């Protein structure tokens, strides 16, 4: 008997119903209250400047034409019946290629309460666009927006809201961080207005504040570049008659800095300016360049060929350009590191 | 109210034929197009294309969809566009495209009381390019988006850019990671064939590549490696192990730069402006070690049968020749 009344309510919902027109098309605006539960803030790609997110995307609005009377207080609808009812055309303003899941059944749930308050949940995967300012790579931080709104309906037709307080409306799961290179610090929920060519739309907005871990870049890039520049200065403490030795030392530390330069760029997207790491490598490349030019100046003023035997003819003095570069070049590299790690750990 | 609006929408499609063009025996219908560009995702030099996301919008006036009494513009559901006449406009440059379908398909139908109808689409298209990369990376590009009707000639359909030069908006908001949009142009023209003239709209952008990246990674170390090859001219000819270890390791460091920029840079397999410079700098490094064998053979081989004059010559000529090489290079491509 209860199953007969249930099927009679389902058969008589959509009689005289028109899904082509908004509820209250000449009466009032449609307040669709939205709600997002984030299950996985997925892989952020720096190359494509994008990110992936899995959401449970809840919507709630009132349709007066779907009121009913019966024993139950809430209905559950088939996908065939949910596709015959008006549903707001929410799209993501910065979505690149997003997926509505349907394994094994379509992950949509449309519920009708006794006063016609529709509730509509969807499980979505949204690959959205995150523009980045890579001026301080890798010691940078940026906010990835997730912005959605109605496509066809203006402010005077469909208005979006949140189902709770705005900061409490987007809930990221406690297991839902899923980042290997970034640290999800927190979210910021706001709301805005576009002026398109068609008219004013209400744009819900959730920002996602990310900070890059720099522990990988110190060990892979910074510390071998520092230790190679330390080496190129360490060749100043050799004797000046080691003309093959300081030559072999000089050119190969340039080749070692060349190998460190190309590998660090490969694990980075193709920006058209100087990142913070690009400055550090180029300046550290200049010290290793200046070390071999320094030995060329030492070699020009040598005046002898043989080295000092340990028991003692005349011998070479330790050159003044060597003794000064022992003090000058470790100091200038030490000053530059104090400038570098105070400028880019401040922004 | 609301029942009168429902009655109006039901009688607009009462007897509507979706196969009839507006003014089917009369004048050609004028379709005005309006593009709001969301982003340009990537500009690929290997695949010779670019990805373009935009809000492609079409306006035309259908007399069968005119209504009176209702003072508001009827914004309908997107699934009524399967019940209307829409123009058969496609893209000539189109490699791959799709209308976004999450959470629903991003169409819009907004009827106006005089019969004007808006059909908007959020389209992510991949449009082809013919890129001239002979001056890479010091070049300006020109990629376009050609819009054309598929079936109807100019006797039946006409195109125009709505608002003239302010049709395509959102170009100044585009920040490409390696290009810079100099100027976009809007061309409207009929393409005359033997059958009849077909309407065509053209949207194009100029892409000047930013060169600050290539100065740092590519040009600057190849200059500094060439200067280190000249260090063997202020070293005596007696120091054989010193002057060889300069020049031999310097041709290897040029090799590791040339080989790993072949792997890092995009794979365009013809001669570019960066390949001519890197091969040119490899010659100066190669000539700087031919200089020492010229020195070493004259003293130690042609000795028992000047040597410092060769080094004194090379200290002036090879910086002068490499500065002359940079003069010819940076005036021919810039």
């Amino acid at each position, epitope marked *: 008997d209860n199953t007969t009344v249930f099927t009679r309510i389902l058969d008589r919902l959509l009689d005289g119903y028109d899904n082509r027109l908004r509820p209250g098309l000449g009466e009032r605006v449609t307040e669709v209250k939205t709600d997002i539960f984030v299950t996985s803030f997925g892989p952020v790609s720096d190359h494509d400047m994008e990110y992936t997110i899995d959401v449970f995307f809840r919507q709630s609005w009132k349709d007066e034409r779907l009121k009913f009377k019966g024993p139950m207080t809430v209905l559950r609808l088939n996908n065939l019946m949910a596709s015959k009812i008006w549903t707001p055309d929410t799209f993501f*303003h*910065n979505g690149k290629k997003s997926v509505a899941h349907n394994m094994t059944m379509p992950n949509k749930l449309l519920r009708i309460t006794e006063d016609g308050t529709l509730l509509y949940t969807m499980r979505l995967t949204v690959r959205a666009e995150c*523009p980045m*300012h890579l001026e301080d790579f890798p010691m940078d*931080a*940026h*906010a990835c*927006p997730l*912005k959605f709104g109605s496509y066809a309906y203006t402010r005077a037709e469909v208005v979006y809201e949140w189902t709770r307080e705005p900061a409490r409306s987007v809930v990221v799961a406690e297991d839902g961080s899923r980042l290997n290179q970034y640290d999800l*610090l*927190g979210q*910021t929920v*706001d*709301s*805005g*207005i*576009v*002026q398109s060519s068609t008219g004013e739309y209400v*744009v819900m*907005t959730t*920002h996602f*504040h990310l900070k890059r871990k720099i522990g990988y870049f110190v060990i892979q890039t910074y510390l071998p570049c520092i230790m190679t520049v330390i080496l190129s200065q360490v060749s100043f403490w050799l004797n000046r008659e080691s003309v093959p030795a300081r030559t072999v030392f000089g050119v190969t530390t340039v080749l070692t800095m060349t190998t460190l330069s190309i590998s660090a760029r490969n694990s980075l997207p193709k920006v058209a300016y100087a990142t913070a790491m690009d400055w550090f490598i180029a300046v550290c490349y200049a010290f290793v360049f200046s070390a071999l030019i320094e030995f060329a100046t030492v070699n020009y003023f040598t005046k002898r060929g043989y080295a000092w035997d340990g028991k003692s003819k005349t011998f070479n003095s330790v050159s003044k350009i060597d003794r000064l570069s022992r003090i000058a070049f470790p100091l200038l590299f030490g000053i530059f590191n104090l400038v570098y790690w105070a400028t880019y750990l401040n*922004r | 109210n609301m029942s009168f609006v429902k009655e109006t929408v039901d009688k607009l499609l009462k007897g509507y034929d979706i196969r009839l063009r507006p003014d089917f025996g009369g004048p050609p219908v004028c379709v005005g197009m309006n593009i709001d560009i*969301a982003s340009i995702d990537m500009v690929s030099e290997v695949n010779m294309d670019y990805t373009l996301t935009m809000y492609f919008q079409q306006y035309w006036r259908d007399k069968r969809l005119a209504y009176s009494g209702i003072p508001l513009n009827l914004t309908l559901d997107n699934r009524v566009a399967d019940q209307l006449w829409v123009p058969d406009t496609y893209f000539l440059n189109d490699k791959k495209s799709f209308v976004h379908g999450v959470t629903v398909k991003n169409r819009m139908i907004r009827l106006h009381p005089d019969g004007t109808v808006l059909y908007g689409l959020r389209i992510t298209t991949t449009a082809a390019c013919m890129m001239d990369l002979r001056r890479y990376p010091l070049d300006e590009q020109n990629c376009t988006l050609e819009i054309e009707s598929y079936g109807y000639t100019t006797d039946d359909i006409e195109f125009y850019w709505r608002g003239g030069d302010k049709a395509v908006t959102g170009v*100044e*908001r585009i*920040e490409l990671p390696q290009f810079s949009i100099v100027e976009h142009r809007l061309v409207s023209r009929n393409v005359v064939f033997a059958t009849g003239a077909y309407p065509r709209l053209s949207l194009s952008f100029r892409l000047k590549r930013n060169i600050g990246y290539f100065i740092l990674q590519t040009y600057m170390p190849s200059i500094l490696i060439t200067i280190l090859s000249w260090v063997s001219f202020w070293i005596n000819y007696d120091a054989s192990a010193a002057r060889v270890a300069l020049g031999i390791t310097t041709v290897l460091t040029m090799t590791t730069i040339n080989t790993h920029l072949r792997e890092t840079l995009p794979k365009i397999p013809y001669v570019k402006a960066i390949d001519m410079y890197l091969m040119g700098c490899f010659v100066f490094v190669f000539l700087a070690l031919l200089e020492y064998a010229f020195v070493n053979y004259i003293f130690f081989g042609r000795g028992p049968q000047d040597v410092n004059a060769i080094d004194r010559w090379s200290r002036i000529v090879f910086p002068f020749t490499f500065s002359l090489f940079n003069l010819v290079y940076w005036l021919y491509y810039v």
Partner: nanobody, 108 residues
């Protein structure tokens, strides 16, 4: 009366950046007035929503604030900010570039 306080930027293209407008009354509290993202999305403070209209010119690298319906409580200094808001769009410590200031006086 109405007003239109402008902000001409120089030295850096801020199209990617979020250019905003603040307000500092006597009381040392920089209040959010208006912001705009790269996608032309207008964010307004709740006390100033519907009155002040923000617009950015992405070609000439500028942001404009259209003052409208000026109550006498609007007598303050208007700061043109420009940042990439991090914990931001409402926090003053997320915008890393600042204007000089404009002493707007609304008498009655």
């Amino acid at each position: 009366g109405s007003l239109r306080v402008s902000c001409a930027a120089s030295g850096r293209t801020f199209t990617t950046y979020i250019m905003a407008w603040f307000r500092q009354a006597p009381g040392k509290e920089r209040e959010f007035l208006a912001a705009m993202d790269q996608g032309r999305i207008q964010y307004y403070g709740d006390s100033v929503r519907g009155r002040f209209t923000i617009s950015r010119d992405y070609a000439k690298n500028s942001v404009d604030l259209q003052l409208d319906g000026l109550r006498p409580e609007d007598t303050a200094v208007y700061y043109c900010a420009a940042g990439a808001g991090f914990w931001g769009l409402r926090t003053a410590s997320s915008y890393h570039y600042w204007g000089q200031g404009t002493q707007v006086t609304v008498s009655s």
